[PDB]
Design a protein around this ligand. Sequence first.
Ligand SMILES: CCCCCCCCCCCCCCCCCC(=O)OC[C@H](COP(=O)([O-])OCC[N+](C)(C)C)OC(=O)CCCCCCCCCCCCCCCCC
Ligand SMILES: CCCCCCCCCCCCCC
Ligand code: SF4
Ligand code: SF4
Ligand code: SF4
Ligand SMILES: [Zn+2]
Lengths: 182, 117, 205, 44, 115, 156, 89, 91, 186
Amino acid sequence: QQTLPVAEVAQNLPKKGYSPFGTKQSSVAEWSLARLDDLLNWGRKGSIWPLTFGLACCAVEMMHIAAPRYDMDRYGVVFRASPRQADVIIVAGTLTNKMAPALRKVYDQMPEPRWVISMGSCANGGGYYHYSYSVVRGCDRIIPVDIYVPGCPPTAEALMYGVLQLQKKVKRMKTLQMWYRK
Amino acid sequence: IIKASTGLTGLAVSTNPHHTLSALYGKILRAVSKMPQDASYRKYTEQLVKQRADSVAQHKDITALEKAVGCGQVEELIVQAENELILARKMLGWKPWEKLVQAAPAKQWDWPPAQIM
Amino acid sequence: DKPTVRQPDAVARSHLSDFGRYVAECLPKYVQKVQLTAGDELEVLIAPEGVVPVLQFLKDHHQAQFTNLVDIAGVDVPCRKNRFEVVYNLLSLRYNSRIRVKTYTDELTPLDSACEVHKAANWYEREIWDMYGVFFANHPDLRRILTDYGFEGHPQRRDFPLSGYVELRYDDEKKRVVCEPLELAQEFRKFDLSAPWEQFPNFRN
Amino acid sequence: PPKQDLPPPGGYKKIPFARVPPKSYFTGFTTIGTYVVVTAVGLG
Amino acid sequence: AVQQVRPILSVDREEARKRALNLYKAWYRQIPYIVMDYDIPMTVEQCRDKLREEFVKHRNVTDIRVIDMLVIKGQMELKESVEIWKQKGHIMRYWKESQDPKPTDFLSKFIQGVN
Amino acid sequence: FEEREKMMEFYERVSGARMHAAYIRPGGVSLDMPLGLMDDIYEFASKFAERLDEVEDVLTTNRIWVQRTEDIGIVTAEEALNYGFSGVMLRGSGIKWDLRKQQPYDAYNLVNFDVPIGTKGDCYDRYLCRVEEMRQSLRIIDQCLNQMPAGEIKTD
Amino acid sequence: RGDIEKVTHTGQVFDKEDYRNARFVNAKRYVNENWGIKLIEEVPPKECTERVVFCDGGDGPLGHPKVYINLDKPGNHICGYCGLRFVKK
Amino acid sequence: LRRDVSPLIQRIRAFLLGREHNLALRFEDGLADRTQPQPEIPDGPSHLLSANYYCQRDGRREVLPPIDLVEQQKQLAASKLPTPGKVYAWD
Amino acid sequence: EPKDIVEVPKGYVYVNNKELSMEFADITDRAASTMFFGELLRGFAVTLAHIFKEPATINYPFEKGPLSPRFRGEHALRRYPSGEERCIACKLCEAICPAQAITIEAEERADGSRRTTRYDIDMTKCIYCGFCQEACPVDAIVEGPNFEFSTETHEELLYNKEKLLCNGDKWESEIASNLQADHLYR
Ligand SMILES: CCCCCCCCCCCCCCCCCC(=O)OC[C@H](COP(=O)([O-])OCC[N+](C)(C)C)OC(=O)CCCCCCCCCCCCCCCCC
Ligand SMILES: CCCCCCCCCCCCCC
Ligand code: SF4
Ligand code: SF4
Ligand code: SF4
Ligand SMILES: [Zn+2]
């Protein structure tokens, strides 16, 4: 555990910059691949397209980032009906026994790269229906999850916190530098 | 002098409601006349449909008939008479006036059920 | 007066008492016991073989126009000889009232379907088929409605456990959602909330 | 002081619930006549 | 002892046996349409062997109401297999393809775990 | 949904959760309303009539909405009674039945409002019935803001 | 890193041979630095004159339920809710 | 005082709306204060300490098992037909 | 005025009940609105008017939405002003936790005080309902104001006793202000 720095210490530190991979990497090819990766992650963290999925009550909150108080289209985020035209599936609601192959098929038909936001307590770990017969204990055991939005109804502030943390995860996602070091 | 609409979809207005009601009431009497006299359902249905037939025969106006019966509009009275005619046809075969077909099992209608007693 | 105690309706009590005695007079064969519970609700306990005509009587009599059948509820009592009980709740719009018709059913004994009387039961008994497992004879479509397609057993039966018997996961050597025996990561902690001292002296008789 | 959450004395003014129509400017005869006049001027 | 109950679709044992044989015939006809459509890794002969094993583990019952309840449930699975009404994950549930088999000898059960 | 988010803000003000309030309990309510909720609810109910007027100016009069709703999904009243319908699907088919007026509960009989009844039974009549329930709910909200007594919030 | 081998206030630490220290190679262990025992024995005992005293947490309705402690027995009497110590001379 | 467009665009919006426009957006002047004085919830009818006993206020013990109506008529007995309630016209 | 097909009762409102007028003026009015798109132009006018409105968007995360002092968020374990932790291991909160998220194990502490040795909250089983806030007699467990606690990993959403104590230490000022401004409602 570390805390946020004091303003004198914060004035001592320099600016972080946009690039999470640093300014220089002591090679021309490494710098070129890092800047290409920065451009690619800027194009990917800008306008992730979530999927019209909406299993349950947490979905009603999902329209409160559609609703003009929070405005998910300001961030590039915009809903698409088909899973082929989507980067993100927001698994939000109760995942039951009949929806296990449905969610697995919709996730598998969605093309790479794939990031899944788990919104709500039922999608995280079953929640208030954890000890029931029909509810799958979270959506981790069927599909991978990158972001766990924790509130049962999350505030749309807390859902866009998960969306912005997904954007920061895509911003730190590195593939071309990995290709150079593989 | 005719109703424009009933304010209620699926039921159109009736051209001659009085003859339809009287025919259904006569058919209810013909179906109930085969019932035994000791059955209370026959006496109750005869009292009902005799009162309704006197209400139909006494009043010639439609809305006066609907006010005098007081149950509702006359198309719903036709619906009620048709339903009771279907019931009076069915209860001859269902045979309700006899004794209990099945006796009470032990501890069947006891609440709370888990007690020893 | 007494502001905490709920005040009942005397005229509704008198009307439901007169109608309950009227129902018990009209059908001596199928009506087994007419009772009037607290809260001004009439329960007509009937024989199983009178499941279909009595509701038909309650659909079609002039003082019994229970046009709406709002739901059918099943209660699983395992201590009785006939295990399940089936509760038909009917709403009358003409006389502005409600009635309950209660019957008893074994695990294998049929019930005659009320789909000829009320069409809402066309799914409602299906739920009682899925949750409890009583067969409804002369049903136009009797299938499991709420549970899984490969589900075995009936859930809201009290012999069935709360967490079920099986779980589902995803498996990559079969590329499929597969079925596994149930293991909770944390078990359901059962709480003993049974009352050690009785509170209501009027219900021990 | 408001020791409990209560409405002010004197009550509230009436909350509107009826649908007011928007402002209508065109009669149908006026619309057809203006269309005919505009079309004739345009053809000239 | 003796008990008078309402029957389910059959009066005696011969009609229930005829209904079970009708289930076997209908499941035999439905197996080659199950194999070509559901995308499952099971050969038609393995499917028929599994159908035979499912009938064999219910040969032991004798009560006609139990037999007819089994006939009703098998007809429900047949109706859920004529129309597709299901996925490939639930068809393979009869084979139990994910559960690793457990030993039955007491020494291996003693070594592995208390179950 | 801008106004709907204002009402979930009101829900968060009264109970602490935006959607699943856990507020109405057996024996009254859990907590008293906070101070100053009257002015916020009153300002919202003053503006919501104009918001509904704009929404009805866009949606209700249009030919495409009428052609997509009217004479479509017509349900008869005897089918509504036989299939156990309830609420707006009863009220859209001409049947005069509202449970807030016939069997009143929880002080609906000290407030006054109107019950909207459809005529044809199609989608357009049910949409107009929903908008009229919205406006009569604004009327009941006006009456409940007009009169409330001072006292306890739960049974004793 | 010393947070892996650090002991919490419940007397719990993972052994060096345990496999459960492999979960802390990517996420640091959370040990609360404010132990309640040290901060409750740092508070000096309160000297009182009356035979019985009352404790309510020091906040009124925001503390613990009000309990009465007897002070006729010599020594330090500990409130069972908040841990404050009372003494009578 | 409040953020809006200049009154030419306001008059254009009021002409295009077909009605006079009231601002949908909430402002700090129109709402109540976020910090309010600390309230006192008044006591109910039975927080008086003198007169009340629980035996006259116990609603849970005044319930009874349901009454067998045929048995009640048999014990207490030794025109229009009975309706379930008042006749309501939904037509 | 258009006539009424069915006469309305008192206290009821009939929609789609007005007969269409067959006089020449109303037929010409509806004909002009048909062929010249009158209601379409009215809807376009209303939409073009609401283009010129001010947006209701707030600049997240620089601008955050309005809330209440009663708001239910992350569970936290408070401490006394003397520094001792408030919880006395009475297991009321876990007895009332309706999804059974809390797990409490306790023993006598070395100074004799009744304290916990394990206070786990499954945050993926929580529903953020405030029953533990109402059930707590010493006001130990509260719902903190925090809701920006989305994690990348499912295990980080299973709070230990130390994580709840760190949340109680970190969020102490706002929780103290909320329980100052909220306690006479409860
Ligand atoms: C700055 C510009 C602002 C405005 C921009 C937008 C412009 C307006 C909208 C453009 C198109 C929008 C999208 C498409 C909408 C399509 C709507 C539509 O057609 O709906 C079907 C509806 C259907 O009509 P209805 O809605 O009445 O349906 C009932 C009738 N039945 C079922 C029989 C059809 O409307 C029409 O078809 C109306 C006619 C359209 C074509 C116009 C015909 C004009 C005829 C000549 C007039 C002569 C006058 C007299 C002259 C006398 C001379 C002597
Ligand atoms: C509906 C319009 C009817 C008339 C259209 C033509 C108008 C102009 C005719 C030619 C005028 C020539 C003047 C020298
Ligand atoms: S997590 Fe909560 S709000 Fe979301 S679907 Fe489950 S119960 Fe509903
Ligand atoms: S808020 Fe409710 S669900 Fe969450 S820990 Fe507390 S009691 Fe349990
Ligand atoms: S209710 Fe409060 S004091 Fe009791 S065990 Fe829970 S957190 Fe601790
Ligand atoms: Zn103390």
